[PDB]
Symmetry: D2
């Protein structure tokens, strides 16, 4: 039988608000914008609600502080200190298991891989149904910077970022393709140098700071919101789409069962598969260092 | 000759940023986000740029503090006391006539009708190429509340708000219809009462405060940004769309050459016509009072 | 639980193929294209499948001659002498109640009101989950011609066609409005005359022939396909949309339990309500005559 | 100043009709549907016109037999026997040079590469402003078949077809990528064999017949129409998008100046660049044979 798709967004900050806006604008689902803070989620939901007619959308967008309102959610996006982040996840995990245990859960909470692992543990949801948003944001930046260099549509650039965050982030130069032309082929054609590739890789790692330093009083929120919506579409439309994200990886990249940044295939069953990229020896080590860092910090919590 | 469409957004605040976001998302145009503040337009533009690939859009979005970057802009949307705002418009006006005098200018400044008029006078752009955003926002809220009562799709509700801001706003109840059924016909069918209509009319007038009181430290910005985009779309795509906005009214509603909230037809030549709604005597008084306040506040100029 | 939405299109003709195309393009659903003819549904489905990547859609589109492939269909659109068409509907009805009895069924068969009723009776599906497509097509043409007169965006025109097919069609001139301005108000303003309204009403009734005479060897199919899609969208997305269609009218327009062209509200439970338009005495007579023909042709059943 | 974009579609057959439909549906431009045949273009344009309100589009769509009506066209798409095809192109070429010499011209007329060269010659339009639709159709099929095998979103497959038609068509296996994973890497992972790759390549070449044999009374028209619209979008939105198509190639693929199937970059100046794919020795020879075939048939006309 037909029910409207339902996306619950936990946290009415800047990311959460724009997720609700975009979801509503696209008529992808109804939105429940959850936050404990009084007024904020109601105000944004009312504001967004007024725009629905402007976009020709019939999506319903409401604000709340009651987990009961996320009952039957198809997707839960969690945007809401290490210990403090864990406290928030624990609270949502209880809400999700009571009211929407079949939900696909997308975490946007640092340190990502560790926090995603924690939510899976405390919620007890299938590992394939819990993931984290980072790779799509990082990969989109990576693709954009490569696109800027060649003067081409970024959508026609293939480029994935795997691993964790900061220096744990691994932009896989070996994954890079423009219109089917590999990066190695461009070097030989004299259209790019290894120095310029290294700069793009470095630029991908520090892009967050480029935005943060310019915003002065906050971090990026337009692109992280778009990324989360793209992950939610993949699930809701059963796209079998390639989504770099923090996912439960076993028997790929030499790990046996751990949350890490990988190129997944997402569909109606959440993470349905993981792709194995060719990595250079230095990319192997950086990926190994990222895995160790997640595994070690998971010992603490 | 093909050049990409170009929209200049003046003011990198909350409304401005979302305009750039949505324009970029839809691939409606390239975006120049202008502001004086150091870094803010640059940072939002970079962030929005990273999302372009996610949306499948090739729109370029840049931040700037230089009016030379708004040159060749097809549309300029201005989001940036009475004299303080007019001072900002003077500065923007000099940018526009220097770098993009053929642009379609949409103002989002309080008080709207006064400020739009002032920009037109100082810029000296044709009257049809300068307007203000309010009617689309107000009418959308109006349509939404009517929709919510009847339990129908708000896009299938026709409902227009004319006149001025806040209390000067006039939700024309005679413009209201749902699927071809007029509002008076629903009263006779017992599906709505006049008291419920009055509440909806009242709700429309204070909806801004319902939002603002909830947000606590700011005013509405998601819906205002979308409203501005729909106006830019109507111009850029030559839709001949019914857009309620602050427009120069020459021979309609008993006035002769003043900016006021009216249902316009917007196309490639800007405001191309104005529709005349049937107003009840009470709605006429309300419109009269709105027009009268615009004369008073505009006269204050020393 | 997430499964992809699924639309079954019965009949791989010109209307059927374009429905599959557009549904796939929009990623509204997976598509099963059903027909008896050897190869035709398969070939169109393969061709349409190749375009999916071009549109960025992951919709699956397959051809079949087996009713087991329409199982779990959320929407069934039926495009495939009086007795000859009813014979096709009998066969489709048995497929539907066997493999997808919870489907929302949209019929596109002449004569519509009669054929829709027949499918409902033979299938025995709830009355609210069976309807026919005509009113959306007719109203769209109606809105378009009104739009063309006034030189405005046709989406900003409210105009509804009710009643039956061809001559039995009733363009309700009292439902007509442009940006909140009723049609009678335009007459008083000198922007339109009653003779021009009559031409537009007349044009709406024979528009099918204007197209058919031009195409020479067939009838309209681009617009009918789109009209069917909008109906499926209203159901699949629970829009509560104003959809003029052939629907079961129980306590509206002075009738008591008959299929007829009426402005419905369509949502996730199918036809969820019916709106009542103010009809002039002349429009009532025309509606009466349409309803009377439906009784006669339906009675012919031996 | 703002003018509505204008696309002229020459030929009101099945491809031309669906181009007009899609263009209108997307509100990409106004459409002028030109055909000499009486009634057909008027009827389809009237029919399509009625649907515009259903799609919320204000695109104007008209039918005509007068070249005067294609005045100011931004794009011309030509869908309307070797000699007979040349006669049609000659006629359009005269219409375009008189009424819209700044138009970007997309040809869909076999044999493609030869016919595109001919239109450029007789019209005298800049070489970068005249091209042919084949590669996008062939590449889309190629991507789809690879996507079907791996069970992934075809949009996340990168795969280009270059060269000409039939056996002259060259699906570049070396261009193939899924989520950044090259085809060679999948073979090593045991997810595909060389035999299955060969079948996909063969399937791409004969796909036209798979559709034609099933339709019985015509050839493919839904996908070829979509392909032409995608090429027109690239131009009108100045996308700098990767578009495999019949384009004027000099100093790439060992040719000095000839129309052939290549991966182009399309923007507001038409074909603005051409990408060089790695080709295997057998792909080189097949490409060479395609070039020779076009060059030789151009000697005839």
């Amino acid at each position: 039988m037909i029910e409207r798709r339902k996306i619950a967004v936990i946290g009415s900050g800047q990311i959460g608000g724009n997720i609700a806006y975009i979801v509503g604008k696209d008529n992808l689902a109804d939105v429940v914008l959850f936050d404990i803070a009084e007024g904020i989620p109601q105000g944004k939901a009312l504001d967004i609600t007024h725009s629905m007619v402007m976009f020709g959308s019939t999506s319903k967008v409401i604000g709340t502080n009651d987990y009961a309102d996320i009952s039957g959610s198809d997707v839960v996006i969690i945007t809401a200190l290490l210990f403090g982040n864990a406290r928030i996840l624990d609270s949502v995990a209880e809400g999700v298991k009571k009211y929407c245990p079949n939900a696909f859960v997308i975490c946007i909470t640092n340190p990502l891989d560790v926090m995603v692992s924690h939510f899976q543990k405390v919620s007890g949801l299938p590992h394939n149904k819990v993931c984290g948003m980072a790779g799509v944001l990082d990969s989109s930046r990576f693709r954009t910077f490569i696109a800027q260099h060649f003067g081409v549509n970024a959508s026609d650039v293939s480029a994935n970022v795997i691993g964790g965050h900061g220096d744990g982030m691994v932009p896989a130069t070996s994954s890079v393709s423009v219109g089917g032309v590999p990066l190695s082929s461009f070097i030989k054609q004299g259209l790019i140098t290894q120095e310029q590739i290294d700069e793009i890789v470095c630029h991908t790692r520090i892009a967050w700071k480029e935005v943060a330093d310019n915003l002065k009083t906050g971090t990026a929120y337009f692109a992280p919101a778009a990324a989360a919506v793209k992950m939610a579409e993949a699930y809701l439309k059963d796209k079998k789409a390639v989504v770099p994200c923090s996912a439960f990886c076993s028997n790929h990249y030499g790990v046996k069962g751990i949350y890490m940044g990988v190129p997944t295939i997402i569909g109606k069953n959440g993470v349905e598969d993981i792709l194995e990229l060719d990595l250079t020896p230095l990319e192997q080590k950086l990926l190994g260092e990222s895995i160790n860092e997640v595994n070690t910090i998971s010992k603490v919590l």
